[PDB]
Each structure stands twice: as structure tokens, then as C-alpha cells.
Symmetry: none
Subunit: 250 residues, 2 copies
């Protein structure tokens, strides 16, 4: 695992950052930054939509033609106040869609999926408000580390999970974002939130990259730090990931 | 037409009652009782929710999935002290939901809908207290007669109103109550209140009936009288309507 601190350190200055890049098929570490932070678990926040998408498609509760209907009540973010699809649900981190999905699947089935995915601490208890089904993955009980997310991403693209193959590929397709400088394809998902009872912000940007040659890799960019009252932790994590990926020219 | 005094008289004894049944499509009068009372305008009270439902769905401020959140303060009736849906709003005559809707739509828009609906005296000025927006339809400024309500109901089911077709059908669906003795389907809404500055009670029960053959009709059962301090005018109007409709066997 080539240490890329020389390029990553300036990008993460002012925060506790981490970056990991692994080969999809062999699990060989290609590049890393601040392994200590990489082993620390924290709320997955919206990156949990990757797992929820797998569950929703596998359970056959949604398909690519599904249209989630807005209930006309303000959700807190204007882009959330409209109808969505499985694709835009991921793109805009539409929490209310996730909540409709968890309610349909049920707590028991979610717990079973968490074991299948070996998802971090697998704690979906939430906060005594019994709000697990609606917020367990949002700066709540559920926690997972960047290292653990890497392995989860590997199992997905390698099809080493007990779920429909189509559930996996439909989820990956819905994560497509853009092509990098050298044409490498980028598929990813952001996640962000404020640490409970503190001012700190946590941020994630993780996913897959497919080189023009066809070689596949998985990556995770994460950080925790004081970035003010505006949630920009995932914007920063994503920007840093793209900068690093283009520099590595993989 | 058809005078049904023989059956209606005892049912309305002790009050000034009225009953009207018209063919939806042709406007032919099928049955009637005490036309003098039928031509008298009075506050629509909760039957106004039929109009508000049309406005809310047409303006797209509510969806069948919408959940109205109780503000946690005592409302006067225990069934109102809970969260509601567009269906239970009608079912339990939840006034606070109507008030949230009128404030969202705004006075100017309400005035335009009143013209579109040719709704009685169209007076939404209320009481001084500048409370028209939240109380005009409750034994206040707004008045409409049973004959006028019949024509409004006809325009609804015949889709002769300048509003979305879905707004009309969603409203009718939310008015469904039960099937009558011969399988005819009953859709309706109650309304009741005390006459301002008097001891009298006004009551309404109106809506649509769809025979098993598919033939549609509109009806209105209304009354005004001294029934004590317990508001039972709409309970009586509804009971009388169902008794009459079953006897007519339509």
C-alpha cells in the first residue's frame, strides 16, 4: 500500500482524514493515507443507501421504474421536495425515500441483511425513541469504519453477497457519477452529518472505479473535523477523492 | 318529482328538516321533503371540507400520503388530538387540519375557488376578529342552501368544475362510508353547529350514492332545531338519510 501522504495531507489539513484504494478482485492495498483514521468506526450516514439499495432490489420492493411520490410537506432541503427515482434517491441523498424503504422491509429483515453484509457494528437500535427504522444510520447507533466499508464494497462488485445479481448491478448503475481525466469510470456515494452532542462533522465519499482497461478498484475517502455550521464534509471528501484518483492516473 | 313526507315527516319531527335526492347526470328531482327549508341558506360547517378537499388536491398542497402532525395542544375533542390523513380529516371532521389548509392556500385563492364552485353567498369574511381564513365556514359568514349544495355535488361527480379530475375523485374516495342494504355505495360528509347567538342546532349529511347498476345520484339531508346542548343534529341528519335511502331502494 503506497503511502500517498505527500499528496493527501494538504487536501485533508484541518481535519482527521483517511483514504484507501484497494484492488477489487485481489484485495491488495494500492494506496493509503492515515490508516489510524481508517480503522475508526463512525456513522455511515447516507453511504448506508448503498446497503439499502441492495436490500430494496433484492426484496423486490422497488425496480428501476419506481417513482417515489412526495407527500407535499417540506422535508428540509428543497431538492427533497419533489418526486424521485431509485437513481435520484442516491444522487440527492433523499432520506425520506430511505425511510419508506426501511418501513416496508422491516426491522427483522434489516438485521438479517446486516449480518449478510457484515456491516460494521450492525447496531440498528437507533436512539428510547424507538426510531431505529427511521434514523439508525444517521449519526445514531449504526457505525462502520473505512476499512470495513472497503470490504463491503469489494463483496458487492465481486458478487460475494447472498443477494440477487441484478440487485447488485442496479445499485452500482445508480451510483454512476462521471468519467475521470483518463476515462476511468467513477461510481460513488456521499455521506455526511454532525457528530451527536458535538460540533464536529463527519464526511464520506466511497465507491468503485473501472479503468479503461477494465481493471476494477474500490475506494473510500473519509474525514472528521470542525468545518463550521455548514455541512461540507462530504463535499470535501468527494473533491479530495477525485483529486487523488486523477493524480494516481489509474 | 316525488314527495316523501309520509316517511320523512316523523324522522324530522321536532325540527325544520329537508331532504333532496337528484339524478347526478340529468338533474331530475327523484325525492324531496320540505322544499321551503331546502331553499334556505345556512352555514355549511364541516360539509365545507368537501370544497376544501377539492382546493387542497387541485392546488397540490396535499397528497393521499400526506400526514398532518398534531401540534400537541388540546383541541377540544379527543379524536382531534392525534395525527391525521386526508381520509381521517373528513371522517372525524378535524377542523385544525382545515385551518392548516386554508392558511396555506390563502384568502385570494380561496375567493377564486368559491367563484369556480359557485359556492352559496361566497362570503369568507368571518367575524372584528379577522378570523375568516380559519372560521368563515363554521357558523359564521359563509352560507349555502341545501338546493345549492345539490348542484355543487352534481358539478363534482359530473366533473363540471375547473379543477383536476384526480382532485375530484380523491375527494369522493375519501368520502366513502359504507354500502347500503341493496349494495348501493354511500359517500358522504356530515356538518353541524349551533346557530350564533341562539340555542338552535344546524345539521347536514350530504353526498353521493352509486347503485349496483352504476347509476349515480346526489343527496342532501339537513335540519335546524332545538335538540338541547348536545350537538346531535348531523347524527340525526345522517340517520334520517340512511333510513330514507334504504326505503327508496335505489
Amino acid at each position: 500500500s503506497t503511502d500517498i501522504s505527500t499528496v493527501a495531507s494538504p487536501l485533508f489539513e484541518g481535519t482527521e482524514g483517511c483514504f484507501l484504494l484497494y484492488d477489487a478482485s485481489t484485495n491488495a492495498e494500492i494506496a493509503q493515507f492515515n490508516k489510524a483514521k481508517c480503522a475508526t468506526q463512525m456513522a455511515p450516514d447516507s453511504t448506508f443507501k448503498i446497503a439499502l439499495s441492495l436490500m430494496a432490489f433484492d426484496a423486490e420492493i422497488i425496480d428501476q421504474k419506481t417513482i417515489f411520490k412526495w407527500d407535499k410537506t417540506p422535508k428540509g432541503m428543497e431538492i427533497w421536495n419533489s418526486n424521485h427515482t431509485p437513481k435520484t434517491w442516491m444522487q440527492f441523498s433523499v432520506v425520506w425515500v430511505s425511510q419508506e424503504i426501511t418501513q416496508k422491509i422491516g426491522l427483522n429483515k434489516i438485521k438479517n441483511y446486516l449480518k449478510d453484509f457484515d456491516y460494521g457494528n450492525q447496531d440498528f437500535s437507533g436512539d428510547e425513541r424507538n426510531n431505529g427504522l427511521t434514523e439508525a444510520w444517521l449519526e445514531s447507533s449504526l457505525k462502520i469504519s473505512p476499512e470495513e466499508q472497503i470490504q463491503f464494497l469489494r463483496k458487492i462488485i465481486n458478487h460475494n453477497l447472498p443477494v440477487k445479481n441484478s440487485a447488485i448491478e442496479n445499485t452500482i448503475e445508480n451510483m454512476y457519477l462521471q468519467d475521470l481525466d483518463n476515462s476511468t469510470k467513477l461510481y460513488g456515494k456521499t455521506g455526511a452529518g454532525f457528530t451527536a452532542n458535538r460540533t464536529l462533522q463527519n464526511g464520506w465519499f466511497e465507491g468503485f472505479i473501472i479503468s479503461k482497461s477494465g481493471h476494477k478498484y474500490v475506494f473510500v475517502s473519509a474525514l472528521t473535523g470542525n468545518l463550521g455550521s455548514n455541512l461540507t464534509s462530504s463535499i470535501k471528501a468527494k473533491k479530495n477523492a477525485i483529486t487523488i484518483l486523477n493524480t494516481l492516473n489509474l
